[PDB]
Design a protein around this ligand. Structure first.
Ligand code: GSP
Ligand code: GSP
Ligand code: GSP
Ligand code: GSP
Ligand code: MG
Ligand code: MG
Ligand code: MG
Ligand code: MG
Lengths: 391, 392, 390, 392
């Protein structure tokens, strides 16, 4: 329950930036969204946290800093360097941390003027952008004249929760950030680094508030974080597809969490009607996902396992039929495209050819002695007898 | 029409949010995506309620949701502005049309109507009103941050985005932000409302629950197939198998007179009666012909390279069956088995035959190292049906 | 002086050093502590500057490039902006010439150039144009200086470039790949002043600049393969030393950067750690050394686990979080889906059940394949699965 | 041994026109290029008789021959002029100096000397007299286009352009339509005299026959002989091989005392004799060390992957030989053979030994599949020379 919540909370103070890696279909973004919401009490992104997600077009110029045309005057288009998503957070997490200090950072009129120009949603007019660029030069003249004891403990914890960190070209997006994402290379650490940015030339350093909880999938091995110098920075939490949630009681505890006892009585009798058709056993979908994830571990890899986001939203046996033939059996066929004696073994129907089998055998044969099976759409109670044979 | 391929799309798209109709070419995938949306939204053309786009390899992430696109102003010709793509112009359209019947936007119902005009405006946005468009966009994502999740579960329109040949583009790159939004409990109003932050404009963005995405990928090709396992969870794949049951005598009269409801039903029926009477009065001929080829293709080729039922659907006469055979599916069969003659003779069930009423005659000249290849024969008349009766 | 005896003696010999080594080793730390202890600057700025390279770091923003600059109301006057390197190379040369007086007439003119190089604000067009004239006066002055007075300049400047193998190292050092050598510095045996492309100005590296690269050499296909780059830079292999993971060495490291009162609590936490490890003060040393030998013999010598993973441990639970969330996903990333090796790296080649990180799944594949699963251990049973490595 | 390479460069200069000093790194092929130009042209500084240019991938056509630059004109009148690069400025300067001492070009010789001062002007040109530079250039090419090919076969001031790292830069981008001019048959004075116009400014251009392009080129990155098809036919290639004759005690004393020939050169002799007394009794130790490691490189990898003689050229004591060996060449030898311990041991020819004063001690562990990998060992003192003695 709170174990994955506490495990994120421990590693985000030790290493600084956690990564929830796992097979797709488990609670990676969910346990990352529930962590930042329950720690910052802010249900929508804004000042205290910002959700982004990476892709191949999420380059360096729009993440940290780059040139961006902006004039706000319908004339005299001013080619100025604008800060990306990260530098608008790390400068915000710094100047929010420079409020609670007593007398070390003597900027109490000039720091709050910089914070109100960093959280301003309306884009910056040039008569106030020259104030923002001048106060930011004051900030890195201020930071550097502060002791490390009055800079390590900055109070408000900021989070840049990112998603699909492996999907973007992570060594290119992280530019100057490739040497700043340790816990002791930030501000306030034992070895602080006021590193210099290329484009604007103004120096930069991450504050100790900003934590980067970044979820990724590791079934695509084409794009996995194999740089061995961006696995030292991050702390990698294993989020395995846990079939413990697909019980009768654990599915009743999860799916009846936010219903206010109105449709909960409808949900209770619907799950009572689902498991009465599976054989009066409370432990069906637990060992169904277990006997598939074990049988897909020994064949493909540990990482291509079926998650528990597929079967978690079933209500009746019809909804299990529409999540079997339309979400996971097309997924199981594209692991093993025209590899038929293997996909027959994942459903352990290897001796079973005809009858209540998902892949019935074609009565034809080949000229060179080959054969291929055909998918059989089953319905009714014969579908469950074709499914209970997996267990 | 409403029996299987309509009622299993509408049930699954309302449950998962996104549907991919994967299947071999020649099957009603683009058609069942087009028929379902037009019969739902009651708008036979794109525009307001739904948008039909298609993917390709020249398709950009910058032209899908958000990118820097240089526009042409009057006095400054090279002006680089950030322009929303087609998905951000249908996700914002599905949001501000659904937000006409809400009760927490009571300060800016005129501002939501003004934002809906700027999104329905097919004219290019002048820079005097583009800042009015950007001020209303950042007002919108301030308004849904103060909207409860109980009121964003039911938005009364139903907007659709039929993307066609989804698998052709770089779907991991086109769906940049959409690889974590496209889920039923990760849109607005769901159990996990996620408002991600876009790169270029810096404005937050979240797919509304009003939207639905009906992809129709093709799975005959394999280098463009959708193997992204983190993306196959977002969608809900519906295999539309090529059904030969749409090629019987009663089924061809029921499929071709439903659309053409003119006075030529007496003309089509006497022509379809004459076509099957030349086929030996076999009402299940073309059903058996497509079935005994798709099974014989499944066993030697992949199961997703099968002949669809869109080739033999538009047949009218034996002369029209001769045109759809020698020019559409027989060059297709010579493309599947390209100089593999022992297979393509077997698929047409002419394996022992090498002379006479046959599609591929054997050449009477062998090669130097023992190789031997065959030759097409343009058949006609009742000898052509005698070469088709050997398949079934 | 245990590792500056190599670094400070190779800078006076060659001019620049690349501290290459597998990650988790003090390559950035040695390169930062050496520069800070010599220039007496705890922060960058005047006497040194920290940058790093990446794939989107190009030639125009490093040394010299074109850049539009509209100040308040003027048209877009395309100024040429000097990159990071020329704002260190000119700054080392002008601070070099400011201390001596042989023929450098105009010490107020050289001081006027030094103020216009440490400007935090961007230069106004009434001040940039006089900055362009004084830079032309600088190279006309240096071109009439003897080599005996330019071979030594006391303010040793430093440009530390972390991750030097990331950026396109031939595209970055464009006019700099035949200037960084000690023989071709501004005052060496062959004083070579090359002409820069964009601004047209002459430019040569002054003999103050020491380019302290720290290349990560974990992954291949981005390392310095070109041998012209392997000659200007005198490399230093910084091996991951597990000698910093004994009891008396780890206690001496973490007390060096700590206070007086918390040092007793830090010493008590390290006594509690090695009392739970079986009174073995040589445990984390032989843990890292007998897992770096197994990585050396199978994969290669440059994918070894560093000594920055285990350096920040304070209890058995802190070793547990390092072992399961920092080096076991690292070990499963080296040998992905290759289970017969990763059992042997932990020398659990025969152990398949019990106190082992990888239990065996009970059934094999259809054609003789068998996979494992990462078992989470806790407590003294975890130590019993860790002390069998050594 | 330096005059033997000056006679080889001067032979292949007047025959071909331009030269590539290609060789493995650690050779003096930039220093041979730099000292031959200084010795022949009698100009120690890179200006007004020769020019140094380094190529890279960011080097373009606009800064090499000519492009457009803004100037310091009037305040509201910023102008884009055609500022010439380095190759156009050096070929004009070779043509202006060639016609300055010509007898038949005496029509405007008082103006050609005015054009020479503008080309040796070591600053950006003033806008009040840039049109004087433009009109004198337009006067010049009008005069050379009205002169025969008899008086242009040779010009006595021989200019040079030392191009360093010529394989780094993309030679097709910076030589747009002007790579054909470099041949002696197509220069300004051959029978195929080709005065090509330039794509900017409308100015004609043709390189004079005295401008020589002495290129230096690494050939150990990837290039062997087939990487440079756009310049492999125009340029004469000279293998500047690593000579280990410069590591003898008689040669090392003469090289370092060539520049520092003051009283401290005596202090070098008592320092160099201290080195060659710790290497045994011989003076041929560093020569045989480089020869018996360069033979063991050219027998495994390639000829031009060879260790040059510039690493060992700056040693004075055993400590500096310790710094050259463990930090510059053995971290260079480990990257020649990345994780192949059966042959990097054999380059140091200690293949029988596994430990005991070897640079690569063997780990006591074996492998599962049979892999055995060694480990670098730092040696110091008389043990290191005992490990260097077994190489020779
Ligand atoms: N209550 C509860 N819900 C869970 C849990 N795990 C997954 N879910 C539900 O499953 C759904 C999908 O999980 P999600 O986090 O989105 O997968 P994902 O890892 O992000 O998928 P991916 O493509 O990025 S790899 C979420 O809506 C979440 O509510 C869990 O442990 N507890
Ligand atoms: N009435 C009716 N027509 C059908 C049916 N299935 C296919 N068709 C016909 O097939 C024709 C084309 O099929 P279509 O859906 O467009 O193939 P497709 O999905 O585009 O094939 P692909 O190249 O993208 S892979 C249409 O003219 C349509 O009328 C059906 O079930 N009923
Ligand atoms: N006291 C002390 N600390 C060290 C030593 N070596 C490493 N460390 C610590 O380990 C941490 C990480 O070392 P660091 O230098 O940053 O690795 P790195 O070279 O940057 O790693 P990478 O960038 O190649 S991935 C540093 O913060 C430093 O405090 C050492 O020798 N002595
Ligand atoms: N006196 C003398 N010095 C030499 C000789 N060969 C090399 N050197 C010295 O060795 C140094 C290296 O030579 P250099 O020409 O700079 O290499 P390079 O061609 O630039 O190497 P690269 O750029 O291809 S990687 C020079 O500084 C020069 O002083 C020689 O034959 N005689
Ligand atoms: Mg996610
Ligand atoms: Mg289609
Ligand atoms: Mg580093
Ligand atoms: Mg050179």
């Amino acid at each position: 329950i709170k174990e994955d919540y506490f495990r994120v909370d421990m590693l985000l103070n030790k290493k600084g930036q956690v990564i929830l890696y796992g097979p797709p279909g488990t609670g990676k973004t969910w346990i990352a969204r529930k962590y930042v919401v329950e720690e910052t009490n802010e249900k929508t992104p804004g000042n205290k946290w910002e959700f982004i997600t990476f892709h191949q077009s999420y380059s360096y110029e729009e993440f940290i800093e780059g040139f961006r045309p902006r004039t706000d005057n319908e004339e005299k288009i001013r080619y100025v360097v604008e800060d990306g998503i990260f530098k608008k957070i790390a400068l915000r997490a710094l100047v929010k941390g420079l409020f609670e200090l007593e007398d070390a950072t003597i900027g109490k009129d000039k720091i709050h003027r910089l914070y109100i120009l960093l959280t301003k949603k309306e884009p910056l007019s040039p008569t106030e952008y020259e104030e923002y660029l001048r106060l930011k030069r004051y900030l890195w003249e201020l930071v550097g004249g502060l002791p490390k004891d009055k800079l390590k403990n900055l109070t408000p914890k900021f989070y840049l929760i990112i998603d699909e960190i492996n999907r973007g070209n992570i060594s290119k997006i992280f530019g100057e950030l490739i040497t700043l994402l340790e816990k002791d290379k930030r501000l306030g650490g034992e070895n602080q680094l006021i590193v210099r940015l290329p484009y604007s030339g103004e120096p930069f350093a991450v504050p100790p508030n900003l934590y980067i909880i970044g979820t990724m999938n590791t079934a695509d091995r084409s794009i996995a974080l194999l740089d061995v110098a961006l696995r030292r920075r991050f702390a990698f939490i294993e989020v395995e597809p846990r079939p413990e949630f697909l019980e009768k009681e654990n599915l009743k505890k999860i799916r009846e969490k936010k219903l206010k006892t109105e449709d909960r009585k409808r949900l209770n009798e619907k799950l009572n009607e689902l498991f009465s058709k599976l054989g009066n056993d409370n432990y069906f979908l637990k060992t169904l996902l277990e006997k598939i994830n074990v049988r897909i571990t020994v064949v493909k890899d540990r990482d291509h396992r079926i998650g528990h986001s597929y079967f978690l939203n079933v209500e009746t046996v019809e909804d299990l039929h529409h999540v079997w033939y339309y979400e996971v059996l097309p997924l199981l066929m594209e692991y093993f495209y025209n590899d038929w004696e293997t996909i027959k073994w994942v459903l352990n129907e290897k001796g079973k050819e005809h009858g209540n089998v998902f892949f019935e055998k074609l009565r034809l044969t080949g000229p060179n002695g080959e054969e291929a099976y055909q998918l059989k759409v089953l319905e009714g109670d014969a579908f469950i007898g074709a499914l209970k044979r997996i267990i």
